[PDB]
Structure 1
Amino acid sequence: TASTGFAELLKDRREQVKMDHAALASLLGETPETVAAWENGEGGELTLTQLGRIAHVLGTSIGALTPPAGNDLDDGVIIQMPDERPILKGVRDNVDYYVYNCLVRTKRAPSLVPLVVDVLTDNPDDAKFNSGHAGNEFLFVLEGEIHMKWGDKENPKEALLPTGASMFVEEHVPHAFTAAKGTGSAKLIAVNF
């Protein structure tokens, strides 16, 4: 698969840049038989570094010589039951801030990371910001009331969101969440796409 895809993309690329097994090999200090081996599907044990060397000589990246993520769908769909969710308890400055209940994901859409996030803290004065992250994020308040903070960590804008509120935070925008003051905790669905 990785090995197979590599073999195909290696040949595709070698041929688009006008090299034969010899020129490529000569260029990489390998034997034509070796390079042919790789194109036969025997490149599985090539190291990350060697793959780098190969991509270099071929004027491209490892990515362009490796296959796409692959298909994990059943006739177009994938399902996840409520009790098979992976769980990570997020700590921020030695404080148990959030609990990430990871929802369904798919190799067909790598950037889709949907989550149910338990917001453990309920003291807006102590909101712990992140530094922003790549990818846009859609949020929805599943329950309780949320105190949202965003922008500059020292002088941030704020918003109090009741159950049912929907939000969007552009990529790289730093943000932090807590339950409404004294309400203990709240919950939300977060969709990174």
Structure 2
Amino acid sequence: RTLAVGKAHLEALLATRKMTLEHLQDVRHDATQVYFDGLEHLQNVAQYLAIPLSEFFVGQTQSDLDDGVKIARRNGGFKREEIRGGVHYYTYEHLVTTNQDPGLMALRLDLHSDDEQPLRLNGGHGSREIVYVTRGAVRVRWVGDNDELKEDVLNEGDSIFILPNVPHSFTNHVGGAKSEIIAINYG
């Protein structure tokens, strides 16, 4: 019908440009919200103010925290198996996620496939990563300096930090011994 943005927030954006609401042609408002014909109209104002569109929605989505915190339950959220050409590779389970840090992706992974399983590196991630081995023994492989493959074995209680965009893979060291890790991507 109409696209709403928070008045106070929009007024602060205008103030960084030394403007007020009067400097916007023909928008309507009420006590708390400013109304736009649609995204296209909003884009035009954004262009005029030389602010990117994203800024106009910052802080508009309601926090999903309760009292400064958010709780998630085992087996409670998103989960799926990862199966590639008939080979069961991972179980991916979301741990707590929040709209107060969309850059945080915390996972619990079951590692299902073995030694006769082929290498399938990722392309690396913009996020930093720390991984901790909750159970079993885990083969970690990654692409090091001068694009050379490296490897090591992480046992229960070991951990690893991985810089952005380093390509890497986690598999069971033994096979038939299913291992588990927690992987936290951030920043």
Q: What residue is the counterpart of 1:51 in the other structure?
A: 42
Work out whether 1:10 is the aligned partner of 2:2: no
Tell me the percent identity. Answer: 28
* Alpha-carbon shift at residue 85 of structure 1 (Å): 2.8
More helix by share: 1
Work out whether 1:130 is the aligned partner of 2:122: yes
For structure 2, list consecutive stretches of 5 or more residues without a partner in the other structure. none
Work out whether 1:73 is the aligned partner of 2:65: yes
Give, as a single letter, the amino acid of the residue that structure 1 aligns with 2:44.
R
Give, as a single letter, the amino acid of the residue that structure 2 aligns with 1:172.
N
* Alpha-carbon shift at residue 84 of structure 1 (Å): 1.0
Give the total of aligned pairs.
181
Distance 2:122 2:62 in 1: 32
Distance 2:126 2:4 in 1: 30
More strand by share: 2
Distance 1:15 1:75 in 2: 31
Under a length normalisation based on structure 2, what TM-score does the superposition of the two structures give?
0.80
Give, as a single letter, the amino acid of the residue that structure 1 aligns with 2:77.
R
Distance 1:76 1:3 in 2: 26
- Please give the per-residue CA displacement for 1:126-173, whole angstroms capped at 9, x wherever unaligned: 121110111111111111111101116x73110111112111111111
For structure 1, list consecutive stretches of 5 or more residues without a partner in the other structure. 26-31
- Please give the per-residue CA displacement for 1:72-111, whole angstroms capped at 9, x wherever unaligned: 2222222222131320223457754222111112222322
Question: Does the aligned pair in 2 maintain the 1:124–1:178 contact within 8 Å?
Answer: no
Residues 61-100 of structure 1: matches in 2 within 5 Å?
A: 61-68=52-59, 69-91=61-83, 95-100=87-92
The CA RMSD measured in Å over matched residues stands at 2.8
